[PDB]
Design a protein around this ligand. Structure first.
Ligand SMILES: *[C@@H]1O[C@H](CO)[C@@H](O[C@@H]2O[C@H](CO)[C@@H](O[C@@H]3O[C@H](CO)[C@@H](O)[C@H](O)[C@H]3NC(C)=O)[C@H](O)[C@H]2NC(C)=O)[C@H](O)[C@H]1NC(C)=O
Ligand SMILES: *[C@@H]1O[C@H](CO)[C@@H](O)[C@H](O)[C@H]1NC(C)=O
Length: 241
């Protein structure tokens, strides 16, 4: 019978970033609709309730930057958005804008970034993978089950991936079941609100730590309750009969 206790650990790490960039603060904008061949679907589940969950689908961004270098492109730009898809509506989860990026280097080497805009509930237990293209969730509560949509924009061109998240082991004893005032994900918006430009990022989401520190803060909380961070997160499975 495995104990359910806090454990000693070092404070959250302060990693050195990959590179120096200018952070663009206090920007807003309408988040594009997530709706409308069809979308590549993947599946993510956890064998144990206090496991880490990954949402991983290599989007082949390496090739599309290689394509741009072959056309002598001087730069590229990018936007990464996550949503929770429900009946009729979508919750915005994550927004991140990369501008003036170098295509000869690996994705993300950009002269300008916004901070990542996060849903407040989600940011307490989840952070982007190291390549900033997937998500890691640290022992999510069962209420996290659902359909998560990733939208990758390169040079204005979007590509979508869905993740069907299934959590049959239930809550973990230390899962975060709410943020302040018990709030869970933020408001679900229907397609029309997105189209009419009402889902302003600075209004519904909050600017947050870059991936290195974000991973460090959550990993610390996760580890202090006994969790082990895996050394690798494999690609999420597709549909299998
Ligand atoms: C990331 O870069 C994208 C392009 O690299 C930007 O999207 C492009 O913005 C252009 C404006 O500079 C659009 O302009 C088109 O060109 C003529 C002018 O010659 C206009 O009159 C047209 O009306 C206009 N056409 C269209 C189809 O809008 C580009 O078309 C547009 N291209 C794409 C593929 O979106 C993004 O704005 C930029 N993203 C960010 C966040 O800065
Ligand atoms: C730029 O930042 C990198 C890491 O972020 C650091 O190693 C380097 O010393 C910095 N250089 C300057 C000139 O700021």
């Amino acid at each position: 019978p495995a104990p359910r206790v806090t454990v000693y650990v070092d404070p959250p790490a302060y990693p050195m970033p990959r590179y120096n960039y200018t952070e663009r603060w206090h920007t807003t904008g309408p988040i594009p609709s997530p709706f409308a061949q069809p979308v590549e679907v993947r599946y993510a589940t956890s064998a144990a309730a206090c496991d880490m969950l990954a949402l991983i689908a290599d989007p082949q961004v390496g090739r599309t930057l290689w394509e741009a270098v072959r056309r002598h492109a001087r730069a590229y730009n990018a936007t990464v958005i996550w949503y929770k898809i429900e009946s009729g509506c979508a919750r915005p989860l994550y927004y991140m804008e990369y501008t003036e990026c170098e295509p000869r280097k690996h994705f993300g080497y950009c002269r300008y970034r916004t901070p990542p805009f996060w849903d407040s509930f989600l940011a307490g237990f989840a952070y982007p993978t190291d390549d900033e293209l997937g998500l890691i969730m640290a022992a999510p509560a069962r209420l996290v089950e659902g359909q998560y949509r990733r939208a990758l924009y390169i040079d204005g061109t979007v590509a979508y991936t869905d993740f069907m998240v299934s959590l049959p082991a239930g809550d973990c004893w230390f899962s975060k079941l709410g943020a302040a005032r018990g709030y869970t994900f933020g408001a679900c918006f229907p397609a029309r609100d997105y189209e009419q430009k009402k889902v302003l990022r600075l209004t519904y989401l909050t600017q947050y730590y870059p991936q290195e520190a974000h991973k460090a803060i959550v990993d610390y909380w996760f580890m202090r309750h006994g969790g082990v961070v895996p050394p690798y997160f494999e690609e999420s499975k597709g549909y299998e009969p």
